[PDB]
Curated annotation (Swiss-Prot):
Family: Belongs to the peptidase A1 family.
Disulfide bond annotation, renumbered to this chain: 255-290
Name of the featured protein: Endothiapepsin
First and last residues shown, out of full length: 90 to 419 of 419
EC number(s) stated in the UniProt entry for this protein: 3.4.23.22
Organism: Cryphonectria parasitica (Chestnut blight fungus)
Length: 330
């Protein structure tokens, strides 16, 4: 089997992407944030504290003939940005782009933090990292991908994110029409539960490639590209008027600036992030100062190849016995 679903930016900055997912019987369609940096599938629901719901579509288990409470199970997660959610757990039938998993853990939010409430466009998350990060207790549950794997034609999914435009998540096959040239595959470590890999270096603009190992995670659920302070300083030094602002919370630059591209290495291959992808627009409405899409990972504890990086590529998440990551230009 295979599945194929379109993913759409939630706003004009590509802050996140939402993908329609069918839950229950008859189907309840919710728009989820597919997150390769976490491993919980959780939804706004009929159980979510009423005051914490503001425009989201909710899952109502009591209207699904295939829903079953996982009695005694609870979940609680915190994300890198400090947001959080928690609740109890159902199993139900979940379909993504035609691909159906029966008995999927669907984690029903009883509580969500302000950032989730405030985002009316996101009905929940679908985690695609490794199931070892799943937060269900007492017994950890498997991700959609994990559950689907034995059914898939090939044990893969692919992320093809759009710049200011829709893209695609495919399960079980590689669409050889969605990229140019070849896919370069690189080793993954699952030790921390992430799609963790090592880039071979970077270049700024038309500068020479610097060969240096950068360990990081492929994370569709993070907006920006977070890299070591040395790397990030080298980039912004090439932008007239750019500086790091503690009050804004990162590198800023004059909105009129022309930004250089940023190249990262995948083995002996290269992925080029165009300058425009690195412009995340005014720091506040009407400002002539703009926020950078490449920021320092210092203080995060991990480098993160988030949407800014991933949308410049066709990305293969290979969940074979020995997992790998593949990157193609497109």
């Amino acid at each position: 089997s295979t599945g194929s679903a379109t993913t759409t930016p939630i706003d004009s900055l590509d802050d996140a992407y939402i993908t329609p997912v069918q839950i229950g019987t008859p189907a309840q369609t919710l728009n989820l944030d597919f997150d390769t940096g976490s491993s919980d599938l959780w939804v706004f629901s009929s159980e979510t504290t009423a005051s914490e719901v503001d425009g989201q579509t909710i899952y109502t288990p009591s209207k699904s003939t295939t829903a079953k409470l996982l009695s005694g199970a609870t979940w609680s997660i915190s994300y890198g940005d400090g947001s959080s959610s928690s609740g109890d757990v159902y199993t139900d039938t979940v379909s993504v782009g035609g691909l159906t998993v029966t008995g999927q853990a669907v984690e029903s939010a009883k509580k969500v933090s302000s950032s989730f409430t405030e985002d009316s466009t996101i009905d929940g998350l679908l985690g695609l990292a490794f199931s070892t990060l799943n937060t269900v207790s007492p017994t950890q549950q498997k991700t959609f991908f994990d559950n689907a794997k034995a059914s898939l034609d090939s044990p893969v999914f692919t992320a093809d994110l759009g710049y200011h435009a829709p893209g695609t998540y495919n399960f079980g096959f590689i669409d050889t029409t969605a990229y140019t040239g070849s896919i370069t595959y690189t080793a993954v470590s699952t030790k921390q539960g992430f799609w963790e890999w090592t880039s071979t270096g970077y270049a700024v603009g038309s500068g020479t490639f610097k060969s240096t190992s950068i360990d990081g995670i492929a994370d569709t659920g993070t907006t920006l590209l977070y890299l070591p302070a040395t790397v990030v300083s080298a980039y912004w030094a090439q932008v007239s008027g750019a500086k790091s602002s503690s009050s804004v919370g990162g590198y800023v630059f004059p909105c009129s600036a022309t930004l250089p591209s940023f190249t990262f290495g995948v083995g002996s291959a290269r992925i080029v992030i165009p300058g425009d992808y690195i412009d995340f627009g005014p720091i506040s409405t009407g400002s002539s100062s703009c926020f950078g899409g490449i920021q320092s990972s210092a203080g995060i504890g991990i480098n993160i190849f988030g949407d800014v990086a991933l949308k410049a590529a066709f990305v293969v998440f290979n969940g074979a016995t020995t997992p790998t990551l593949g990157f193609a230009s497109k």
